[PDB]
Curated annotation (Swiss-Prot), chains A, B:
It comes from Mycobacterium tuberculosis (strain CDC 1551 / Oshkosh). Pfam families: EthR_C, TetR_N. The gene is ethR. Residues 25-44 bind DNA. Residues 2-62 form the HTH tetR-type domain. Involved in the repression of the monooxygenase EthA which is responsible of the formation of the active metabolite of ethionamide (ETH). This is HTH-type transcriptional regulator EthR. One of its GO terms (molecular function) is DNA-binding transcription factor activity.
Amino acid sequence: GDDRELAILATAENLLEDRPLADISVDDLAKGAGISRPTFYFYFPSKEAVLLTLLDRVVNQADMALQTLAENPADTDRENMWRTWINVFFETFGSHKAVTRAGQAARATSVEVAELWSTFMQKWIAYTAAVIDAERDRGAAPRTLPAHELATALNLMNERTLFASFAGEQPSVPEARVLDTLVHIWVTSIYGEN
Amino acid sequence: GDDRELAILATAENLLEDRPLADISVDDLAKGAGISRPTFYFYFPSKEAVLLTLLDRVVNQADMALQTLAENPADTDRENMWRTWINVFFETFGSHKAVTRAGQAARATSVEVAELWSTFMQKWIAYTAAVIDAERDRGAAPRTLPAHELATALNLMNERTLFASFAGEQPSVPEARVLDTLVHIWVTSIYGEN
């Protein structure tokens, strides 16, 4: 069973590179996976449910990598620490642009997609705030904005900026400049006096 | 003619407070405006076209206010200058939350909405970069990131952060804290050494 599910998921990710989910049919997905339409419906209720699963897989991948990072002793310098951290988002989502793009669009129409994304964001925002607090506690960063509010805006910047870059949106930061850009804003706003 | 158009537009904005565009019908819009369905279709081809016009009106309102600001002699202090500037976006879009929310959703499905927003963003990003350049030229700010790339990320942060706040998204910065948050990030990233 898991093999057919995997093939449906691989097909959907391949087709999402070429067109939106609205222009991909259940027949398209079934054909690509080498199954019939009713066999498709045994594994997934809808093509939307397929996207939800793909998004869950990509988000889980980012989460697992961020968890490994958090578990290693911190950084080398503070700037490099944050670069390595933001890089996990850049590489994970940038390696699944089609799913990322589709998932972002789906948040507006799907409560499940919206909740999946919200849970992920809340977790890594809370982590970011805890890190900022610890930096302040050790005298490495000044006590400026409430850490959770600062953490929220910075992560939301990362979300919008990375996703615009991946998609080549007009306007966007070039993908090759996006890491340096975000890192600068993080380091200045976290460690800068104000 | 302009009166009936105005009434259609007022109705659409009122109904968008309560439900998405997908749950508002042409009959809903016609009834609210005191017109028939075919009279509606004389003024607008679709309910989507109604949203496009509403979004155009709100965006133009922000643009006109930003143009007035740009035309006045600059600031008092640098932080206050940026606060007053970002405030135009906060007040203009925050005074039309329903249309803002609907328009953001529509970017994914409408090339016209996507182009309207892109033109606006490109203009005020270019303006922001020009201001950063001038600050550097006068020795008020250090030459760090390329000004246009920095300007792009900061404006994209503002977009995502304001719109999440307006909508009470989880996660979001509280609406009452959003200005202070964005201003801090702008001032530190623009004027901070790095």
